[PDB]
Ligand binder design. Sequence first.
Ligand SMILES: CCCCCCC/C=C/CCCCCC(=O)OC[C@@H](O)CO
Ligand SMILES: CCCCCCC/C=C\CCCCCC(=O)OC[C@@H](O)CO
Ligand SMILES: CCCCCCC/C=C\CCCCCC(=O)OC[C@@H](O)CO
Ligand SMILES: CCCCCCC/C=C\CCCCCC(=O)OC[C@H](O)CO
Ligand SMILES: CCCCCCC/C=C\CCCCCC(=O)OC[C@H](O)CO
Ligand SMILES: CCCCCCC/C=C\CCCCCC(=O)OC[C@H](O)CO
Ligand SMILES: CCCCCCC/C=C\CCCCCC(=O)OC[C@H](O)CO
Ligand SMILES: CCCCCCC/C=C\CCCCCC(=O)OC[C@H](O)CO
Ligand SMILES: CCCCCCC/C=C\CCCCCC(=O)OC[C@H](O)CO
Ligand SMILES: CCCCCCC/C=C\CCCCCC(=O)OC[C@H](O)CO
Ligand SMILES: CCCCCCC/C=C\CCCCCC(=O)OC[C@H](O)CO
Ligand SMILES: CCCCCCC/C=C\CCCCCC(=O)OC[C@H](O)CO
Ligand SMILES: CCCCCCC/C=C\CCCCCC(=O)OC[C@H](O)CO
Ligand SMILES: CCCCCCC/C=C\CCCCCC(=O)OC[C@H](O)CO
Ligand code: NA
Length: 457
Amino acid sequence: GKTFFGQPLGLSTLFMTEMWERFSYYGMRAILLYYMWFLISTGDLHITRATAASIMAIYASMVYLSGTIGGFVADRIIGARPAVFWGGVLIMLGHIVLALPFGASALFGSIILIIIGTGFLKPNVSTLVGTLYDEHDRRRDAGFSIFVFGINLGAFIAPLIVGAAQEAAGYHVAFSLAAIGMFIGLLVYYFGGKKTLDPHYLRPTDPLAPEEVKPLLVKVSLAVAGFIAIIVVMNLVGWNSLPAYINLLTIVAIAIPVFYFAWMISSHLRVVSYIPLFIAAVLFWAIEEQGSVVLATFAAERVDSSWFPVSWFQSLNPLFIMLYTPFFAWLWTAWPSSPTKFAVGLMFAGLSFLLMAIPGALYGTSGKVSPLWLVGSWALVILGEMLISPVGLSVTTKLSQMMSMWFLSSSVGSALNAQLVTLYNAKSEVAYFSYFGLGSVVLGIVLVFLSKRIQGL
Ligand SMILES: CCCCCCC/C=C/CCCCCC(=O)OC[C@@H](O)CO
Ligand SMILES: CCCCCCC/C=C\CCCCCC(=O)OC[C@@H](O)CO
Ligand SMILES: CCCCCCC/C=C\CCCCCC(=O)OC[C@@H](O)CO
Ligand SMILES: CCCCCCC/C=C\CCCCCC(=O)OC[C@H](O)CO
Ligand SMILES: CCCCCCC/C=C\CCCCCC(=O)OC[C@H](O)CO
Ligand SMILES: CCCCCCC/C=C\CCCCCC(=O)OC[C@H](O)CO
Ligand SMILES: CCCCCCC/C=C\CCCCCC(=O)OC[C@H](O)CO
Ligand SMILES: CCCCCCC/C=C\CCCCCC(=O)OC[C@H](O)CO
Ligand SMILES: CCCCCCC/C=C\CCCCCC(=O)OC[C@H](O)CO
Ligand SMILES: CCCCCCC/C=C\CCCCCC(=O)OC[C@H](O)CO
Ligand SMILES: CCCCCCC/C=C\CCCCCC(=O)OC[C@H](O)CO
Ligand SMILES: CCCCCCC/C=C\CCCCCC(=O)OC[C@H](O)CO
Ligand SMILES: CCCCCCC/C=C\CCCCCC(=O)OC[C@H](O)CO
Ligand SMILES: CCCCCCC/C=C\CCCCCC(=O)OC[C@H](O)CO
Ligand code: NA
């Protein structure tokens, strides 16, 4: 029978939908920080570079958090297929906003649009992949792997294409390419979906019952009122700078999992066992998410890249994932506990940062070093990713609220980054990499020691 790599044909539509959406997202990620440096350098945007770095991290943190809500809105209110569509429209508008002839004044609107749009789309394209398969279809794992390959393909080519356009034709043209990529995704998604997706998913599959509407409304309104209350009090007492708002969002992103732990623990052994795994994932993702902030800074300031666009380094994360997956797929069938995998994963992340301490220690920080240092850094952190990422969902489910905590681990890690990356600068380079690299190796060794008990729990 006709398939797409052995899978139902609908996977082709969803593969390309996600590939082009990830193209738009990671094309933006690869130039947004440099764009803020440019807006800063012309006096248009009145922040420090450290705040610009902080923004990048909390942006990612909010995007991951937003994805924790989009499943519910689709399943219970609008349906999965319209969530992916309108989510894509919002993503597209978010890039259009940065393509328009504005400067710093458009940044917040773009960020809000992409936060909301990505939160609608990302959980719900993954849902639709599952809908391709009946309950006990054994292809299900294979289809999701092919899907993830589409994600990485889009992440790989976007910095190449969008980053080259940015240097040749300017930031506005480059962001317009991100919007067009999403537009392409919407075209394939809309017309391909009708031919291959079940019309059942045009509507919520668990619509709010009559008595559930009001409690939901009350709960949302109380949250909005509380948040706005905190913001007026912040402005009355004079905590109204941009870093003050970033600290508020940091606190919110960390509090949400902390309150969930307190809920489950006080309302038991397995849950206690998950604290060190969640912390290990948080720290892994912190380092991994710094590729686009701290390593991107290092790439622009300290690497000799005179002959190629410096945003291209952002292709190495997905490149290594793609290159490594055959070897790791063979390893998991030829061959370790998940707590051991997390600990070794954190150690590789720590090594990836220790490695970057060497060129400044050996050559000084005033010159430029070879791109191969960053190539080796991403090689190491992605090695850890191959250990932690394929199992993270599994371990957290082996042990609904908590299922979402796996996805929150990368939001918390990015929120931690919003604080940490403000410490990175030309003068702190070597100590920053040394401290956080060694610190992550040491905690990886701690988790190794704890790995047996956790295995029991
Ligand atoms: C099984 C996974 C393999 C990945 C391991 C990769 C480890 C990376 C080590 C760093 C090597 C790059 C540093 C060498 C370098 O910078 O060369 C500079 C020189 O070419 C310029 O004069
Ligand atoms: C049980 C472990 C909890 C995980 C928390 C992760 C670490 C969180 C905060 C560490 C912040 C202090 C680092 C400041 C620092 O010394 O950086 C060094 C460098 O910037 C200059 O020497
Ligand atoms: C597959 C299992 C991997 C197990 C690896 C065990 C740990 C490997 C290497 C530990 C090296 C950490 C040394 C850090 C270091 O020397 O930095 C010193 C520097 O920070 C002093 O300022
Ligand atoms: C300039 C005026 C714009 C007014 C906005 C109203 C837009 C109304 C319809 C736009 C056409 C796209 C709707 C299709 C849709 O609902 O997608 C969900 C599912 O994917 C349908 O297969
Ligand atoms: C579902 C969570 C929704 C949370 C919404 C609040 C998050 C809003 C923005 C993310 C943090 C970005 C703040 C910095 C920023 O917006 O840059 C604006 C320009 O710097 C203007 O100076
Ligand atoms: C609903 C269709 C949405 C499709 C994506 C929207 C992008 C469409 C066209 C992009 C045109 C934007 C040109 C960017 C631009 O003006 O460059 C400015 C230069 O810096 C100097 O003019
Ligand atoms: C965080 C701010 C964003 C808040 C947006 C969430 C919207 C909150 C409540 C929306 C109510 C959902 C529509 C109600 C509804 O469709 O009722 C139909 C029922 O299925 C039949 O009784
Ligand atoms: C921006 C978030 C602050 C809270 C405002 C969100 C509330 C938006 C809509 C709530 C309207 C109540 C929904 C009831 C409803 O329309 O259901 C109709 C039934 O389906 C009747 O057949
Ligand atoms: C949901 C309604 C609550 C109000 C809008 C939600 C936005 C949430 C957090 C705002 C944090 C981003 C602040 C953006 C900004 O430009 O602040 C910087 C100040 O202008 C510095 O003086
Ligand atoms: C699921 C629970 C959600 C809990 C969210 C609680 C957030 C409560 C308070 C946050 C207020 C702290 C922000 C103000 C602040 O830190 O100022 C930063 C700088 O010191 C100002 O210069
Ligand atoms: C599908 C594999 C195609 C070949 C690798 C794709 C390259 C994508 C991004 C490269 C990021 C920039 C790295 C620059 C670099 O590695 O140059 C190393 C040179 O040997 C140093 O002169
Ligand atoms: C268990 C997987 C670990 C992968 C091992 C491969 C990495 C082997 C050595 C990495 C050390 C990188 C430093 C190389 C170095 O410092 O050379 C610098 C030269 O001066 C550049 O000309
Ligand atoms: C298995 C391959 C792993 C390759 C990475 C090995 C990393 C091991 C050690 C690198 C740590 C270098 C620290 C450099 C340092 O802190 O020196 C400080 C100097 O005084 C410069 O301020
Ligand atoms: C010059 C560097 C100093 C040498 C450091 C290398 C030490 C390498 C590994 C130490 C790990 C200690 C093993 C403890 C352990 O694994 O416990 C066994 C159980 O499986 C733990 O749950
Ligand atoms: Na360059």
